[PDB]
Amino acid sequence: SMLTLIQGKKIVNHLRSRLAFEYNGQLIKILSKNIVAVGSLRREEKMLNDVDLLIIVPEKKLLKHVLPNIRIKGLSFSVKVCGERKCVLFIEWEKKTYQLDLFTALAEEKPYAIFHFTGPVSYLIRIRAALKKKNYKLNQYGLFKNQTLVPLKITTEKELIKELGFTYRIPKKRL
DNA sequence: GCTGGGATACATTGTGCGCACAATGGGCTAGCTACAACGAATCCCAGC
Ligand SMILES: [Mg+2]
Ligand SMILES: [Mg+2]
Ligand code: NA
Ligand code: NA
Ligand code: NA
Ligand code: NA
Ligand code: NA
Ligand code: NA
Ligand code: NA
């Protein structure tokens, strides 16, 4: 079940060209530019409970179809839970069962979702508390203020990080 | 901090390791086309 960093790196390199989903009988490949490593893996953590992947979906309707009909070529896996935005799989890798999580994020919300899925839980809690003090709500979908999305002139996770007012930290040192 | 996915009340079993969830069983009760029907609200796990 447990796996080291290089093990999960090999798993992501294997899966980067083997992700797809069934869309009304059509097998759709998931491009590697949309597969982003996240979670404890994006941090150079020595040991991994799981491998966390963020798939980027260009259109909104297809969000229903990616994870519920997710497919992997040539790999055995079980599904414990699966919905529109989150899915966990028990993949079989060399006679060991591994946990592999998939999360979806629209392209408009790429920096936010990446940010929410990269940093450690505690770092996220501290950031969201600091933003909430100023009447703001930050999540994987955007910045909100009085139950209203706040537009930001940003495109990457780093531009988000500075536009929001905190010091940038590469994923490793975030804590 | 903020969200996602899967059951939704109350007593009785099989596990692979005194345990814990999916799966039975039965008095109690609302309402009666001897029908049968939403979908938020809620809670408990899960993710970072
Ligand atoms: Mg993980
Ligand atoms: Mg109960
Ligand atoms: Na999806
Ligand atoms: Na997401
Ligand atoms: Na708001
Ligand atoms: Na504003
Ligand atoms: Na910081
Ligand atoms: Na009747
Ligand atoms: Na009848």
Side-chain angles (χ1 to χ4, degrees), chain A residues 149-161:
Chain A
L149 182 97
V150 180
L152 278 314
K153 50 190 132 207
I154 58 162
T155 46
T156 89
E157 185 215 47
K158 203 175 151 180
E159 298 187 40
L160 175 78
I161 273 280

Side-chain angles (χ1 to χ4, degrees), chain A residues 64-157:
Chain A
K64 161 50 67 154
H65 305 276
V66 177
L67 292 198
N69 320 278
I70 192 79
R71 304 274 183 287
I72 307 198
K73 185 190 262 163
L75 185 128
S76 296
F77 56 79
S78 308
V79 162
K80 190 167 136 283
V81 317
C82 214
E84 207 184 77
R85 290 280 192 181
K86 165 174 80 173
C87 200
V88 317
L89 320 184
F90 280 8
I91 75 169
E92 246 293 359
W93 184 251
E94 316 184 302
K95 307 307 181 181
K96 305 177 296 297
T97 61
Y98 281 155
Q99 184 145 327
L100 182 270
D101 324 301
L102 319 166
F103 317 97
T104 45
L106 295 180
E108 43 159 304
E109 56 182 66
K110 213 194 139 180
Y112 304 85
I114 282 161
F115 183 60
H116 161 85
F117 293 122
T118 50
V121 193
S122 57
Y123 179 83
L124 287 191
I125 294 166
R126 280 200 329 278
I127 293 299
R128 320 209 150 174
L131 291 180
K132 159 140 72 161
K133 180 141 150 173
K134 316 207 244 143
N135 200 25
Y136 273 103
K137 206 182 61 175
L138 172 73
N139 54 23
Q140 55 256 50
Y141 310 118
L143 189 61
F144 299 104
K145 174 172 62 189
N146 282 311
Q147 291 195 342
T148 278
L149 182 97
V150 180
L152 278 314
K153 50 190 132 207
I154 58 162
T155 46
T156 89
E157 185 215 47

